[PDB]
Design a protein around this ligand. Structure first.
Ligand SMILES: Nc1ncnc2c1ncn2[C@@H]1O[C@H](COP(=O)(O)OP(=O)(O)OP(O)(O)=S)[C@@H](O)[C@H]1O
Ligand SMILES: Nc1ncnc2c1ncn2[C@@H]1O[C@H](COP(=O)(O)OP(=O)(O)OP(O)(O)=S)[C@@H](O)[C@H]1O
Ligand SMILES: Nc1ncnc2c1ncn2[C@@H]1O[C@H](COP(=O)(O)OP(=O)(O)OP(O)(O)=S)[C@@H](O)[C@H]1O
Ligand SMILES: Nc1ncnc2c1ncn2[C@@H]1O[C@H](COP(=O)(O)OP(=O)(O)OP(O)(O)=S)[C@@H](O)[C@H]1O
Ligand SMILES: Nc1ncnc2c1ncn2[C@@H]1O[C@H](COP(=O)(O)OP(=O)(O)OP(O)(O)=S)[C@@H](O)[C@H]1O
Lengths: 511, 620, 239
């Protein structure tokens, strides 16, 4: 009766359909089943990096038990999910939590073995005493409590392996991350639940696109769920739009209201210099009211036509809604050039010519490399542009790197700029990679690394590349042509969406 | 009346035969007896690594007492097993625990010399107060026999800090058994598992599960890391002797799910998903074929296994630790023979290097390779843009069927001496100490990957001295005392020394930049030979296929003509820059042209575009 | 001395018969102690910083079982501070660690190893030895032995040893080889560059016998149990 107080039930939740379906991953289920049924020391532990699916496997095993697909030695067994915080909640006195846990263990052992224990994140059991989480050792080794567990691949090493007399009683089951083709199947089988939670519909191409697109942009997470987030956010945004009026009318209305409020207060300014700013505010206000009227008129035409066709006879998420989600995330633009960017990209060499005069070849070569990437033609695993341009002084080779970095971002200080005139000695490389573990500045990372990692779309400039020691080129050797360097902490950063630019002054006069 | 309240009875538990055989370990039991039969300070302590067997020795002593093989002054002693976890339980008051302990000690002392207290994991006796200290006077008089057993580390971490205590204790070191002793032990315990599971166990399996777990699984000790293989092979054979076997219970589960997916992908009101259903059904039929064939052959075999064999243990050790340890299941022996021409699908030329790589896999798999040495570690070098990294990525692309499964470090960043702590970790007592190594901690888990050292020459010549034992011994220790196992990976070392000689210049640069004791541990030092204008067409078509697959996301296959496919290889061939000028020329010719075409309308998706060679350029 | 001549396999052969297992020695690889602060791992951290409970790496393996032979691979590549620590092991007998205890190396067999110079008979190599170490640390050791190169006569016995090793390894699948004396002397005739020691013999074995055997074995026709002879051709060894 203490199991009721200090444990919830898992099969009693899987029987009422309150668990999500589990798809694939048969080898791991079979290994867990065949480890959970041996004579002694019969308790596995699902180990692996976070996100790959480790509680989903236990819930799939519970659903399989409820269905009856398990072997004879597991028919009609209840899975119990222990909770340790609720056992340490009130234990002030010197002998409360110990007898609590002992009563729980006695209630488990009293049964004929008709109970399968399940502690998730079992790395939290090494303490909990003050000494506890250690009296379980006699029963673990004898095999009287079948203890399925699951911990991260580096909480094990940090908490359990430090008690090598305990991690002997556990059998490890390595759960690797799935591939894109298996993520597609998982999504296919898992979509009709979000389809119900949000009153929308989800196209299958929108499931292929999520899995194939969240594998090359979001490189900091793993991939049974790195796409489910895209699908969920797309569905939620589409539901919001299915509610009151959609986007890009909801922005212009808010903007016009604010401009009106500002103009109604800037009018009563007894000044001479502020009367000039009130002459542009009204202009932009009228310009915005124009666009808002045009949008609200086109909206009625679309809806009107739809209703007409319905009486005569943008309502489901799509592969571009997924793209808009993954573009609001990470800031990287991967869309379809929605009629506002195509014109700008076509008149590109004419807007760089407003700040750089001449250098037609360089301007054309940069504009021709931005479009090969926006049009979806460039190599998907390489920087979108990496070229070194050089010449005599006062020519424009630093201006162009600052003229290109402007109209792409509407700003000027939005590019990561390091000037290699200070890297004269070869030991200064650590200034862009960090210090290896065990030195003074280590909990700071690199300076280029931790600047590209935060926004992986800015352009990077290497001024005066010739002035550096001839051993930093070797460091750059793999940034180019692959877009990847590491740091002290071991985390890889991807330079696969940035435009690298290296200026220099060699020759200086040669034809 | 408190002993039975707060303890149990090992002798009673063994009289009913609730224990296992303890065959072996004569000297340890003899020493335990002769120390227990002392006059004063008669209390031993079994000590050793976790898993070698330290409670089994006490269980054997109990069985031996019950049998009557002990000397005179041990007859009818009734060993008792104390449980301090119950003494401090609900003792929420001011003196309850102290008085419980005192009553138990008095009850033990009142018996003349019968009770032999046995506290397991006695390191937990230091605290428990708020006590556990009212035992030293009872101990330094010979009145308490206190048999105990703690691991080799928790002893010095908890008890050596109490030098008053450890003086009243005898230490009995229990070393681990060897492979022959492990086999002898296994031959006695097989009956218990043969009874628990309705299965028979073979002696060949018993000896394989001891000679194999000593080689592959090296993180635990070896009276018991061999028992698990038997205990899991038995469970798997029981599950198989149950309703359905395996490798049919996979095809069935896969076909069911494929049907469920096809039944719901058919009514998809789309045009882009039309070719995505045109292969699901193909794969489903190709799977039903194999399902039917296996289900038919099953009836043949059932009209025309029953006990665990020697390869079932191999299958268990292969499911564990990742490593393939089985014996050439069919479909593999054809893959390994096709290897040499299957790698040529991505790497053209360099057939010497291809053969030298495949010959280290076909050997280590057949089982003729050296066990205590990596399965191949060779450094190949040559000019630039030739394929040396492409080969290292294409090798690990069909051993694991996943490009990212390779362990890739690039030695361009290990330019200075102190960057060694970056792939090994920091010593005990510094800032980054929990994260461990970077190369170490990536092999200790899943020890079957391929390791790539890119531009080995760019590193400070003190990092080679760390790889000096990775080669020829396959082991390095991180900043934790954890010797990892490199004996079954494939090491690859790329470089660019010389780049301007046939063989003598590069072999002089190698001997001038490396040490002889380093060049000696290596396998064949392969030298690539540069590309020839003839076989560049086989690279042109691979690049074109790659580009096609890349832009196939919108159904834009190109009909590249033969004169264009020839022009793309006529120029763009440099005898100095390899094949990267070709990659650049492809996007200078087709890339920017199609990019201008595409976003200015007139090339809307679903269309096919032909290329044709103009007088100088080529038009779309 | 030179490379591949038997320096390491002697420290592994002494323990092999003093303990009946080549894994009963404390083999630490001194090629990783190339930094000054790396002394903390083979001695232990001070009381209570990050790793006090772990204790030393060298001192602990001998405080618990003080009869082990201790090997130091590539002592030349260490830092000139671990020598100042290992010094007090000699002419004293004991070693104190960061914990604050004292451990006695009075029953161990210290063994060092290096590859200094490798260019002179004894004069250049012993000058190099006297140049990097300290003379007060050298007059405490026993004989500073120099190992000799291999000769074609001392190589046929090594071929016999390697063939015995290969045969013992092929006992799992129950195979055994028949090596004709022409092949047994050809394998020693080739692979005698007197600059790389005995290593090239291992590679020649795997290239000649092992590769052919492993290509035949999984192509059927050499199924387990039976024996196989090896004979000589103009150049190669046909099986
Ligand atoms: N095989 C699978 N079939 C269906 N859904 C799956 C599968 N694997 C994972 N998922 C889903 O993907 C998500 C993964 O979440 P969890 O598995 O709960 O995270 P986790 O594996 O427990 O990792 P941590 O360490 O606990 S955060 C959940 O939404 C699961 O429902
Ligand atoms: N073609 C050009 N069009 C417009 N401004 C230019 C042009 N060339 C140079 N300038 C001006 O020159 C100034 C600095 O030129 P930079 O391009 O920064 O010099 P640079 O090209 O980097 O040469 P070095 O070798 O680095 S000093 C700015 O004020 C630019 O506006
Ligand atoms: N001499 C032996 N004969 C037969 N079985 C043995 C022998 N020694 C150990 N075993 C078995 O091997 C396993 C070892 O378990 P234990 O000895 O209880 O572990 P341990 O030595 O107590 O180590 P810890 O620190 O308590 S986890 C058990 O299944 C024993 O039954
Ligand atoms: N033999 C080849 N077969 C197929 N593709 C090749 C071949 N040689 C080169 N390539 C291609 O040309 C490029 C060469 O890249 P890598 O082989 O990685 O360069 P590399 O051989 O490592 O030379 P370095 O010294 O690293 S610059 C890649 O895009 C390869 O796909
Ligand atoms: N005298 C010898 N007798 C038998 N085998 C030998 C002898 N010398 C070398 N070998 C073989 O050569 C291989 C390596 O020899 P080692 O003695 O380990 O090299 P070493 O003395 O450490 O030299 P280095 O420069 O450190 S690699 C071993 O596998 C031995 O079988």
């Amino acid at each position: 009766q203490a199991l009721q107080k200090y444990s919830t039930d898992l099969t009693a939740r899987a029987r009422e359909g309150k668990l999500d379906p589990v798809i694939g991953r048969d080898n791991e289920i079979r290994r867990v089943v065949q480890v959970l049924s041996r004579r002694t020391k019969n308790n596995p532990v699902l180990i692996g990096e976070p996100g790959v699916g480790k509680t989903a496997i236990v819930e799939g095993l519970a659903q399989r038990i409820v269905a009856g697909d398990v072997p004879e030695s597991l028919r009609d067994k209840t899975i119990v999910a222990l909770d340790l915080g609720s056992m340490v909640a009130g234990s002030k006195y010197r002998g409360e939590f110990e007898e609590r846990l002992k009563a729980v263990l006695d209630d488990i052992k009293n049964s004929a073995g008709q109970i399968i224990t399940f502690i998730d994140e079992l790395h939290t059991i090494v303490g909990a005493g003050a000494d506890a989480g250690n009296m379980i050792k006699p029963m673990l080794a004898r095999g009287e409590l079948r203890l399925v567990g699951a911990t991260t691949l580096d909480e094990y090493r940090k908490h359990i392996e430090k008690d090598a007399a305990l991690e002997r009683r556990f059998q490890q089951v390595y759960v690797g991350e799935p591939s894109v083709e298996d993520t597609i199947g998982i999504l296919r089988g898992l979509k009709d639940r979000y389809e119900v939670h949000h009153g929308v519909r989800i196209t299958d191409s929108a499931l292929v696109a999520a899995a194939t697109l969240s594998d090359r942009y979001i490189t900091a997470r793993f991939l049974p769920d790195k796409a489910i987030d895209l699908v969920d956010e797309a569905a939620s945004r589409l539901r919001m739009e299915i509610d009151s009026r959609p986007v890009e009318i909801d922005e212009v209305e808010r903007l016009v209201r604010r401009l009106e409020i500002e103009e109604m207060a800037l009018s009563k300014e007894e000044d001479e210099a502020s009367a000039e700013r009130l002459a542009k505010l009204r202009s932009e206000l009228a310009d915005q009211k124009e666009k808002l009227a045009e949008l609200t008129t086109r909206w009625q035409n679309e809806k009107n036509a739809i209703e007409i066709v319905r009486d005569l006879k943008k309502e489901e998420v799509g592969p571009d809604d997924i793209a808009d989600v993954v573009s609001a995330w990470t800031g990287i633009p991967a869309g379809r050039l929605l009629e506002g960017e195509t014109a700008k990209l076509l008149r590109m060499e004419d807007e760089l010519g407003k700040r750089v005069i001449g250098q037609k070849a360089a301007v054309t070569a940069v504009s021709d490399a931005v479009r090969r990437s926006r049009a979806g033609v460039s190599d998907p695993n390489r920087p979108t542009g990496a070229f070194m341009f050089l010449g005599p002084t006062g020519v424009g080779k630093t201006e162009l790197a600052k003229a290109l970095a402007d109209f792409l971002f509407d700003d000027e200080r939005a590019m990561v700029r390091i000037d290699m005139s200070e890297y004269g000695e070869k030991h200064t490389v650590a200034r862009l990679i960090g210090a290896p573990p065990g030195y003074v500045g280590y909990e700071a990372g690199g300076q280029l690394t931790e600047a590209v990692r935060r926004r992986p779309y800015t352009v990077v400039l290497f001024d005066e590349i010739e002035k550096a020691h001839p051993d930093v080129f070797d460091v750059l050797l793999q940034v180019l042509d692959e877009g990847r360097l590491t740091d002290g902490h071991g985390r890889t950063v991807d330079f696969r969406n940035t435009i690298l630019i290296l200026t220099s002054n060699l020759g200086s006069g040669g034809s | 009346q408190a002993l039975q309240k707060y303890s149990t009875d090992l002798t009673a538990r063994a009289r009913e035969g609730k224990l296992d055989p303890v065959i072996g370990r004569d000297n340890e039991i003899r020493r335990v007896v002769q120390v227990l039969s002392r006059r004063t300070k008669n209390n031993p302590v079994l000590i050793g690594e976790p898993g070698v067997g330290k409670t089994a020795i006490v269980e054997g002593l109990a069985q031996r007492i019950v049998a009557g093989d002990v000397p005179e002054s041990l007859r009818d002693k009734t060993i008792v097993a104390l449980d301090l976890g119950s003494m401090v339980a609900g003792s929420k008051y001011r003196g309850e625990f102290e008085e419980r302990l005192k009553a138990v000690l008095d009850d033990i002392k009142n018996s003349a010399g019968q009770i032999i207290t046995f506290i397991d994991e006695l390191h937990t006796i230091v605290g428990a107060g708020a006590a556990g200290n009212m035992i030293k006077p009872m101990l330094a008089r010979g009145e308490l026999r206190l048999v105990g057993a703690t691991t080799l580390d928790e002893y010095r971490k908890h008890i050596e800090k109490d030098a008053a205590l450890e003086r009243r204790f005898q230490q009995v070191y229990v070393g681990e058994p060897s492979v022959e002793d492990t086999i002898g032990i296994l031959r006695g315990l097989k009956d218990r598992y043969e009874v628990h599971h309705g299965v028979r166990i073979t002696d060949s399996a018993l000896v394989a599960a001891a000679t194999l777990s000593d080689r592959y699984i090296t993180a635990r000790f070896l009276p018991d890391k061999a028992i698990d293989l038997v205990d899991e092979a038995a469970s798997r054979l029981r599950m198989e002797i149950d309703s359905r076997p395996v490798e049919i219970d996979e095809v069935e589960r896969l076909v069911r799910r494929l049907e469920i997916e096809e039944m719901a992908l058919s009514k998809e009101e789309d045009e882009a998903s039309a070719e995505r259903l045109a292969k699901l059904r193909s794969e489903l039929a190709d799977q039903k074929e194999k399902l039917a064939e296996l289900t038919t052959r099953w009836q043949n075999e059932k009209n025309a296994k029953e006990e665990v064999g020697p390869d079932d243990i191999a299958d268990v050790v292969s499911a564990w630790t990742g490593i393939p340890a089985g014996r050439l299941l069919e479909g593999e022996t054809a893959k390994l023979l096709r290897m040499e021409d299957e790698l040529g699908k991505r790497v053209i030329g360099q057939k010497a290097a291809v053969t030298a790589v495949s010959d280290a896999v076909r050997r280590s798999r057949a089982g003729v390779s050296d066990p205590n040495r990596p399965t191949g570690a060779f450094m190949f070098l040559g000019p630039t843009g030739v394929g040396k990294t492409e080969l290292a990525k294409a090798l690990a692309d069909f051993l694991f069927d996943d490009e990212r499964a390779m362990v890739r470090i690039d030695m361009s960043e290990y330019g200075e001496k102190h960057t060694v702590a970056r792939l090994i970790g920091a010593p005990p007592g510094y800032v980054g100490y929990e994260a461990g190594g970077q190369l170490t901690e990536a092999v200790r888990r899943r020890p079957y990957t391929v390791v790539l050292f890119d531009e080995i020459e760019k590193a400070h010549p003190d990092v080679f001295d760390v790889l000096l034992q990775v080669l020829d011994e396959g082991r390095l220790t991180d900043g934790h005392g954890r010797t990892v196992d490199f004996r079954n990976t494939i090491l690859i070392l790329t470089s660019n020394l010389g780049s301007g000689g046939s063989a003598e210049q590069v072999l002089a640069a190698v001997r001038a930049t490396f040490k002889p004791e380093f060049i000696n541990r290596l396998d064949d030092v392969l030298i690539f030979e540069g590309l020839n204008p003839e076989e560049l067409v086989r690279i042109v078509d691979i690049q074109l296929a790659q580009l096609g697959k890349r832009l196939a996301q919108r159904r834009l296959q190109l009909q590249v003509s033969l004169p264009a496919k020839r022009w793309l290889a006529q120029r763009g061939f440099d005898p100095v820059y390899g094949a990267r000028p070709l990659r650049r020329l492809v996007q200078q010719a087709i890339g920017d042209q199609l990019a201008k075409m595409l976003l200015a309308g007139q090339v809307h998706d679903g269309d096919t575009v032909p290329v044709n060679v103009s007088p100088d350029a080529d038009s779309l």
